[PDB]
Every structure is written in C-alpha cells, then in structure tokens.
Amino acid sequence: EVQLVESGGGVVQPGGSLRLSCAASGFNFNNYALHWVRQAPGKGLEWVAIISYEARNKKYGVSVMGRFSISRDNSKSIMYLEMNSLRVEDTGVYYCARDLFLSDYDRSGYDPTRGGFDHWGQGTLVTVSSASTKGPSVFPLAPSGTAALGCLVKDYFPEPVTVSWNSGALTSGVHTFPAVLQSSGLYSLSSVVTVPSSSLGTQTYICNVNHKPSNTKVDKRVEPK
Amino acid sequence: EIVMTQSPATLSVSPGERATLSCRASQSVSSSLAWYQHRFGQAPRLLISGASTRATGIPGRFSGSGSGTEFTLTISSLQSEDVAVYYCQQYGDWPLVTFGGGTKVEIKRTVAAPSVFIFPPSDEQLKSGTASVVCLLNNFYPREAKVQWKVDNALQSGNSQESVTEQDSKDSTYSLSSTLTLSKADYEKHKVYACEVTHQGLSSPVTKSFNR
Amino acid sequence: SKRSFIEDLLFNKVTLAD
C-alpha cells in the first residue's frame, strides 16, 4: 500500500540539469524524512541526500554537494531532486526511499535504534552523456553436439535494448549479456543461445531486437555461413 | 564519517545451507544498523533494522545480531531467490547514514569449466568499416575467468571489453562474453584470431581460434 | 517541534547523553 513512484530520469548532456520526482502514496508523507540513493554501473549503492520531514534540514553526499538540491512539497506528497552541472559519473539509477528514523516520535519518543529505509522507489535511470540517440546495428554471431549462435547489438544510445529469440518461443539456453559502454560513448550488447548442432540445418533462429528510445525494431536471422 | 566494511565480498553457499555475512563499523553505532537485499533488476529491500529486528513480511530465516562495531546477517536455508547483493547501513550517525560496499551471495555448485566459442566478424559488419571478434565462455562456475586475445600470436591489450551474466537460477552457472574491437583495415592485415581462456576448472588454458 | 529540535541537534553533530 505504501508506494513511491519516481519519474524524470532521462538523457542529459554534461553540464546540464535534470529534476527527479518521487510521488508518494499510502502513508502520511509529512511524517518521514526521505532520501535519494543512487547506483552507478558496477558500483554499490551510494547515498545522495536527505530531507527532514518538515523540510527544515538537508544534507548531501560529498560527491554532489553544491550541485544537487533536494526539496519536498508537503501538500502533494512529492519529493524532488534538482541536479545541476551534471557529470558523466552522475550516470546511474536513482532511488527515493522512506526513512523510519524518528518517524514514531509522537507515539514512542526518541529511539535511535528505530531506523532503516523501509520502502524504496522503483528507480529512474539518469544518463549523462554527449551522445545522441541512435538505434543499434544487429550483426549475426554465426555458429561454426552443442552449437552456439547469437547476435551482436552494436552502437546504440541510450540504454536499454531488449532481445528475444524466435519472438520469445526460445528461452532455454539464452544468455543476453549486460551492455558495455564503448569508448565512442555508444553501448554494445551481445545475446547468445546454445542449441544442438543438428538443429542448425533443421531449425530457424532469429533474434528480435527492440530499442525504444529510437523506435527501432530489428529481426536478424542467424544461420551458418 | 562512519565507514562500513562488509566481508566477504562474495559469499558462496550451498542450496539449503546457511549464509553468514559480516559488517564492521569504523566506530560504534550501538545497534543503529540495517541490512538490505538488492536483487538484480529490483529496488533494494529492507531485511533488518535495529541490528536484529526483522522488517515486516521478512521470513524468520533472515536474522541479524551484533552491537557496537561488529554485525552479522545470517540467511538460513539459502534459496536461489536469495541470490543478491546485501548491504549493511549504519544510522548511528543519522542523518549522515552510510552503506557498506555490499556482499554478493551466490549459490555454490560443482566446478564447471567454460565451453568456449569464438565468432569472426560478420560479412555485414565488415562493410561498415569496423570488425568485432566475439569470444563466448558458456555455463561455467565459479565466476572467476580470464580471457586473453591473440592476433597472429600478438597479445592484445586495451581493445577488448567483457561482461558477465547473473548466476543462472536453474544450473547456478555464469556465462561471459569478450569482444575484441578492430578496424576493418587492421582486421584484414592479420590471419589468426585466438581467444585463450583460463579458469580453475581447466587444468591448462583453452584456446579457440580461426584464420580470417 | 521537539522532534525538530532533536533533529537540529543531530544534523549538527551535537552529542546526546546516555
């Protein structure tokens, strides 16, 4: 029933600005400190900022101090994170979270053992980059009693792409790898599947790639050369 | 201000056995300590606050203990749905809360050497002016593996990238893909492309190669 | 209000007793 819904993520150029929103429902918003927490690719959770229940006190992580500004509207139950002077290293997933600390104060007073972030938003992806939107090229990874084949989904921006095989009828043996950020600033992703080599003459194999940000769908059939 | 240090970095536990995670605070946090589960592709989930109080809906096989500067999270009867990164977080210093660096919990299984496959660049990609050579290490365990690229016996450095799947929940293995990026021109100047794989389940390195 | 006072103390690293 408690719900935190985030919005406002997207692509921004280095030096640009972005405002994230956390819409709360199902609890007395005005009773809780709220925080922002982020996760950069391959790294652990990093605390970003806190705002007290009545918006009087705010603190910021050292990495974002002087650039980010946290605020809350205690009449529509929405928290905001204003991000200015964004850097490539600000890229990541951003979560809002509800803090239990001191929230039971009226009923039970000051108990510093009560705490923890008991509810989190779903996360919003922030991409800071000078790249421009581009759909991928899909290249086959041709097979040479188990054969492996796949597709190379190269040079797209921003995340994410989805990949299925035979429109979703083929899931056993599929591995779709995490994308990598290439030195060009474009992403690359591979998806592979292992199959019995016998099927190579018998069974058709097609990867279906969809890149929403560029409205690109590609279907690449993969066959021995 | 208060630094939280988790260990081990990766914890491997047999299905149905018990996972013990450790967290150390650089100074006392009394019992103002919380633990979180972070499953891949989901938001973090509170497990424990106050060092040992289970959060609502958290099953009793999760428990925590400790005060001052040493803490433990115990997960009994480990299940594949428990595979995740686990974080501790102190709030003794509230509002200056801080997270540990995270402990990855994985299912332990028998060692499995990778099946290795190499893929030349496609005819289609060559027209574009770039060439990508792909090496696949499939269904291996544990996660640690090394890939070395060789082009005409010359060891490549700095022109490859790799990434690794999450642990497969059915067979508890990992897969890894390494991509060597060359210009079409350089690709066409060389003959033998080889991927050399080192893994603890192989008594000696495995090499897959092709002539362009 | 008492809550806000306590929080002002904690945001400013004031040591509370016992």
CATH of the domain at B199: 2.60.40.10
* Domain shared by B92 and B164, yes or no: no
Contact C7 A110 (CB under 8 A): no
**Which residues lie below 8 Å from residue B204, measured CB to CB, with a gap of 6+?**
none
Are B101 and B85 within 8 A, CB to CB? no
Domains detected in chain A = 3-128 (2.60.40.10), 137-221 (2.60.40.10)
Phi, psi of B60 (to 5 degrees): -65, -10
CB-CB neighbors (< 8 A) of C10 in chain B: 94-95
CB-CB neighbors (< 8 A) of B95 in chain C: 7, 10-11
DSSP structure class, residue B202: S
Last residue within a domain, chosen from B57, B80, B107? B107
* Domain shared by B80 and B142, yes or no: no
Instruction: Measure Cα distances from A8 to A29, A70, A95 in Å.
Output: 20, 14, 12
The nearest CA of chain A is from the CA of B88 a distance in Å of: 10
Q: Which two tokens stand for residue B60?
A: 């009793």
Burial bucket for residue C18 (CB in 10 Å: 0-12, 13-18, 19+): exposed
* Domain shared by B89 and B155, yes or no: no
Q: Experimental method used, please?
A: X-ray
With the CA atoms of A37, A38, A39 and A43 taken in that order, what torsion angle do they form, in degrees rounded to the nearest 10?
-70
CB-CB neighbors (< 8 A) of C8 in chain A: 56-57
Of C6, C8, C11, the CB nearest to A110: C6
Distance in Å from the first CA to the final CA of chain B: 56
* Domain shared by B151 and B177, yes or no: yes
* Domain shared by B95 and B121, yes or no: no
Chain-centroid distance of CA B95 in Å reads 31
Suggest the residue from A34, A57, A107 to mutate for an interface test with chain C (most C CBs closer than 10 A).
Answer: A57
Q: How many domains are contained in chain B?
A: 2
* Domain shared by B126 and B97, yes or no: no
* Domain shared by B189 and B132, yes or no: yes
Instruction: Measure Cα distances from B54 to B35, B73, B78, B83, B101 in Å.
Output: 10, 11, 17, 19, 21
CA distance B177 to B197: 11
Are B44 and A95 within 8 A, CB to CB? yes
Last residue within a domain, chosen from B91, B107, B123? B107
* Domain shared by B188 and B206, yes or no: yes
Last residue within a domain, chosen from B76, B107, B138? B107
Give resolution in angstroms: 2.0
The residue segments making up the domain with residue B13 are 4-107
The stretches of B86-212 forming alpha helices (DSSP H) are 123-127, 184-188
CA distance A124 to A95: 7
* Domain shared by B102 and B172, yes or no: no
* Domain shared by B78 and B143, yes or no: no
